[PDB]
Design a protein around this ligand. Structure first.
Ligand SMILES: [Mg+2]
Length: 945
RNA sequence: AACCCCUACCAACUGGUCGGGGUUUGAAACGCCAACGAACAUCAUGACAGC
């Protein structure tokens, strides 16, 4: 539920000294000051008003009103007064002053609530970076080999140049002449060579291979070492409490040698130069057809089409073109684009791109014309553009059934001026595509930036993207862009409201947060372009024919794989005789989801996962239960393509048939039909059936693995947070011990913030006595404190007074807490009781396994032992608890041993055990509850609960 | 919905009704950008060839 104040235009309410400054939305992420509050007086800075604000009753808030967007039910909207309670409000954990000191020196004084917000944005950036670097490192370690951990702590520490790493004897001054450390470097170089001739290194085609002609060539050893060292340096920086500190990422021009800068520049220039040098020959058809449709010379919009297609400037625009396009497609005049499959399944994307460009050009041209006209009129009477009016209406939409009506109405409004253009676009056919490629697109000056201009941080993010997949890249880069935009907006706002805080030198990198956002937008556009597989070798063929299912030994598999690209004599097959090789390459090896599965698992075990029936039915039912195209349509589409044409079957029967197809899967059904497969034609239905079956099978396994990886990422974030907060509380001046944080079950922070210590069998004599004496004082001093409650306390019965004395001790114990979360007596009586019954060695196991991603490596081992698969949260914690039981079951004692027995009996997870394992998160109640209760875990699954 | 704050009525006040607020709570401020989410909507018609 969006708050009504944001719809009415109120964006922020800041405190500086004894004054309150309110701020409204201006453009994109920018902010404009609106009101200044002094005591009981409210002044408006600007001539116009984005919102009217007046003082409310008891000076407890400001009533907000807008002429256009009023509250639907007529209730009053009040924004809170930060000075009503007292001084500036504090952080929930009470770490405001420490963080402000760390990030701003003595230039911050504490009479404001603006610096803490940029600090929290930086903290969010670090959070998501720590989430994704772990997955990248695990992928690289998985691909490298077995027991060959090449990336982590203590390896490739980005301090040593490649020359010092290959011949340490000739460069022993850089190692401080230490024989033990020198012998460690040589052993690392041996692992480097063995990793560099791995046949399966080609899965990272972008990172290590470059395309020269029609075939890929491995980069020089310098570049590969530099990339690996950069990734290991990121891994070191994540766990920084050495030469890699917390400030390593923000000072990269003084910590990195010229080699690393050269490698990053090489990669960036490589991606930019191909896009620049291939635009004219690749954008000819679309540009020529659009020119014919509109009726203008291509030179009049070539650059604008460049910015639309390659740089993707239609996304930083204030709204979504795609929704308008879909509303346009919903009409009866243009419905055949969806119904007529046989004519449009090969030109759908071209038509969509053309329509989007037409809409975007319409808006851009209208805005430019209005802006040009608004140059001779007086600075008072000026008209807005259609972009501005649409964004103004969108911002004040209190819900979603109002936002969609706006899209519907404006699509219908702007359809009247583009009917002919769309009707001409709909008349496009693939056959006449080579006709529009005869004349090439106009040449352009360089628009994309070079490697030198971009910062090292952005280039390092682009390098990191080469170890991930599309969804993760999108999430990471979008979050980073949002956080940097917030930081830059706050930094521009701060001068106006009288705050003269400046970043300390080590964190001066954030003084230029606006350029980083633009660079990251370009990188988000770039990261999804390029071939990710390099070449195809025999190892990839074996992996492909091992995920479908075989019961063959290794030598037989090698012979079968050699059959792909060799004859019965020993020479290579002639051109055009590769028909089974191309099928496998195009249908398995070249699938993005297969790349995901290889990057996060073992091919032979994913087949074991796929032989299960319950998980397959669960995934297919999840597909079938998608509302708003529909999930029921997709189930029918699979059945019609994979099984055939039939009528009278319900959803359950189709799901059962598809499950039977998926569960029984083997490579022999293709080796026997090899003759049919090598018959390439348009009437070979069996070939298409095979393709559809393979695609669906891969999709199912991909979903199953992806959800597990996401949940593990959540728990990694949680433990990163507990480590960071332990460091901060130590720096504040408390009595935490960081060296013993691991032998204790990561629960020292929870003990520290709970308050008084009673678990000690030495001082229970005083704590129980001290609480008793302060409890008795509060009862006597009640009429003075709370007279209204005292008038009812006397009327209590004698027995009821006794209960209130027991509760008063819990209240007194809660007054000694060190958080704002744990000062509530409700949560303190809960967290304390959990502290007594934990097992320290079990909690350390949960933390270690989550970081290493060992849940994803043992799904197949315990998938057949589960009783039911109702959700991924329920499946995740069965595998996690079965792993812990393997190592610690004989030595377990207490309630944990009782809990372990329950898992073996009922064959599901234990709710009570999860709460004990989540005790490290107890000092932060929202994270403690979200990570321990299924109902609050997933935001998208809330209708079910 | 969970966590925190506030006006008015009642309440051991470790709790509730009518409603508002929170970028300084939790993967989580607004418009975007994205995700759950499925043949999937591209720098390049499709199929074939090329590894
Ligand atoms: Mg936040």
């Amino acid at each position: 539920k969006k708050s009504f104040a944001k719809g009415m235009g109120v964006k922020s309410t800041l405190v500086s000294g004894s004054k309150v400054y309110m701020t409204t939305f201006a453009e994109g992420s920018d902010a404009r000051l609106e009101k200044i509050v002094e005591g009981d007086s409210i002044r408006s800075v600007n001539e116009g008003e984005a919102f009217s604000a007046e003082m409310a009753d008891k000076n407890a808030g400001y009533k907000i009103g807008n002429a256009k967007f009023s509250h639907p039910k007529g209730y009053a909207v009040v924004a809170n007064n930060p000075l009503y309670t007292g001084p500036v409000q504090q952080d929930m954990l009470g770490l405001k002053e420490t963080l402000e000191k760390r990030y701003f020196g003595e230039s911050a004084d504490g009479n404001d609530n603006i610096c803490i917000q940029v600090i929290h944005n930086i903290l969010d950036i670090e959070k998501i970076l720590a989430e994704y670097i772990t997955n990248a490192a695990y992928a690289v370690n998985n691909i490298s080999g077995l027991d060959k951990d090449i990336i982590g702590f203590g390896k490739f520490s980005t301090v040593y140049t490649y020359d010092e790493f290959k011949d340490p004897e000739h460069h022993r001054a850089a190692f401080n002449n230490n024989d033990k450390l020198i012998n460690a470097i040589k052993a690392q170089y041996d692992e480097f060579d063995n990793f560099l001739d791995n046949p399966r290194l080609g899965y990272f085609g972008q990172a290590f291979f470059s395309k020269e002609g029609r075939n890929y060539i491995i980069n020089y050893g310098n570049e590969c070492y530099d990339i690996l060292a950069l990734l290991s340096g990121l891994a070191h920086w994540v766990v920084a409490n050495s030469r890699i500190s917390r400030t390593w990422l923000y000072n990269l021009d003084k910590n990195l040698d010229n080699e690393y800068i050269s490698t990053l520049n090489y990669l960036y220039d490589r991606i930019t130069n191909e896009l620049t040098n291939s635009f004219s020959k690749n954008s000819a058809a679309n540009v020529n057809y659009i020119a014919e449709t509109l009726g203008i010379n291509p030179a009049e919009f070539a650059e604008q089409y460049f910015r639309f297609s390659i740089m993707k400037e239609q996304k930083n625009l204030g709204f979504n073109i795609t929704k308008l396009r879909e509303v346009m497609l919903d009409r009866k005049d243009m419905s055949e684009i969806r119904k007529n499959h046989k004519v449009f399944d090969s030109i759908r994307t071209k038509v969509y791109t053309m329509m989007d460009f037409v809409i975007y050009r319409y808006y851009i041209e209208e805005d430019a014309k209005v802006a040009a006209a608004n140059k001779s009129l007086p600075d008072n009477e000026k008209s807005l553009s259609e972009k501005d009016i649409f964004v103004i209406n969108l911002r004040g939409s209190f819900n979603d059934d109002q936002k969609d009506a706006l899209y519907y109405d404006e699509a219908n409004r702007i359809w009247r001026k583009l009917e002919n253009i769309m009707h001409n676009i709909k008349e496009f056919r693939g056959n006449k595509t080579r006709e529009y490629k005869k004349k090439d697109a106009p040449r352009l000056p360089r628009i994309l930036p070079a490697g030198r201009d971009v910062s090292a941080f952005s280039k390092l993010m682009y390098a990191l993207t080469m170890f991930l997949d599309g969804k993760e890249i999108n999430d990471l880069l979008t979050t980073l862009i949002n956080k940097f935009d917030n930081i830059q907006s706050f930094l521009k706002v701060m001068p106006l409201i009288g705050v003269n805080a400046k970043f300390v030198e080590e964190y001066a990198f954030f003084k230029d947060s606006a350029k980083i956002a633009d660079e990251l937008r370009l990188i988000k556009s770039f990261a999804r372009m390029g071939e990710p597989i390099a070449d195809a070798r025999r190892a990839m063929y074996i992996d492909a024919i091992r995920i479908l299912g075989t019961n063959l030994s290794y030598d037989e598999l090698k012979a079968l794989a050699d059959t792909f690209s060799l004859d019965e004599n020993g020479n290579k097959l002639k051109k055009g005789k590769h028909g089974m090789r191309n099928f496998i390459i195009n249908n398995v090896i070249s699938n993005k989801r297969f790349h995901y599965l290889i990057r996060y698992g073992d091919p032979a075990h994913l087949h074991e996962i796929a032989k299960n029936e319950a998980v397959v039915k669960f995934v297919l039912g999840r597909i079938a239960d998608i509302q708003k195209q529909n999930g029921k349509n997709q189930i029918d589409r699979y059945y019609e393509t994979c099984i055939g044409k039939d009528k009278g079957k319900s959803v359950s029967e189709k799901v059962d048939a598809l499950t039977k197809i998926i569960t029984g899967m083997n490579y022999d059904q293709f080796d026997k039909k090899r003759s049919v497969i090598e018959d390439t034609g348009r009437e070979n239905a069996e070939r298409e059936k095979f393709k559809k079956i393979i695609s669906l099978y891969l999709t199912v396994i991909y979903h199953i693995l992806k959800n597990i990886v996401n949940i593990n990422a959540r728990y990694v974030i949680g433990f990163h947070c507990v480590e960071r907060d332990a460091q901060l509380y130590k720096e504040k001046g408390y009595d935490i011990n960081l060296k013993k944080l691991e032998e204790k079950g990561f629960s020292s922070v929870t003990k520290l913030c709970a308050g008084i210590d009673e678990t000690a069998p030495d001082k229970r004599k005083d704590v129980e006595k001290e609480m008793a004496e302060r409890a008795k004082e509060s009862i006597d001093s009640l009429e003075s404190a709370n007279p209204k409650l005292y008038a009812n306390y006397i009327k209590y019965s004698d027995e009821k007074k006794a209960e209130e004395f027991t509760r008063q001790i819990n209240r007194e114990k809660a007054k000694t807490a060190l958080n704002a979360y744990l000062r509530n007596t409700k949560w303190n009586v809960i967290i304390r009781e959990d502290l007594l019954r934990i097992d320290n060695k079990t909690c350390t196991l949960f933390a270690n396994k989550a970081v290493a991603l060992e849940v994803a490596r043992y799904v197949h081992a315990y998938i057949n032992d589960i009783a039911e698969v109702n959700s991924y949260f329920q499946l995740y914690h069965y595998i996690m608890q079965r792993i812990i039981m393997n190592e610690r079951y004989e030595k377990s004692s207490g309630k944990v041993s009782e809990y372990f027995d329950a898992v073996n009996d009922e064959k599901k997870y234990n709710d009570r055990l999860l709460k004990l394992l989540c005790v490290p998160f107890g000092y932060c109640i929202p994270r403690f509850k979200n990570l321990s209760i299924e109902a609050l875990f997933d935001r998208n699954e809330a209708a079910k609960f």
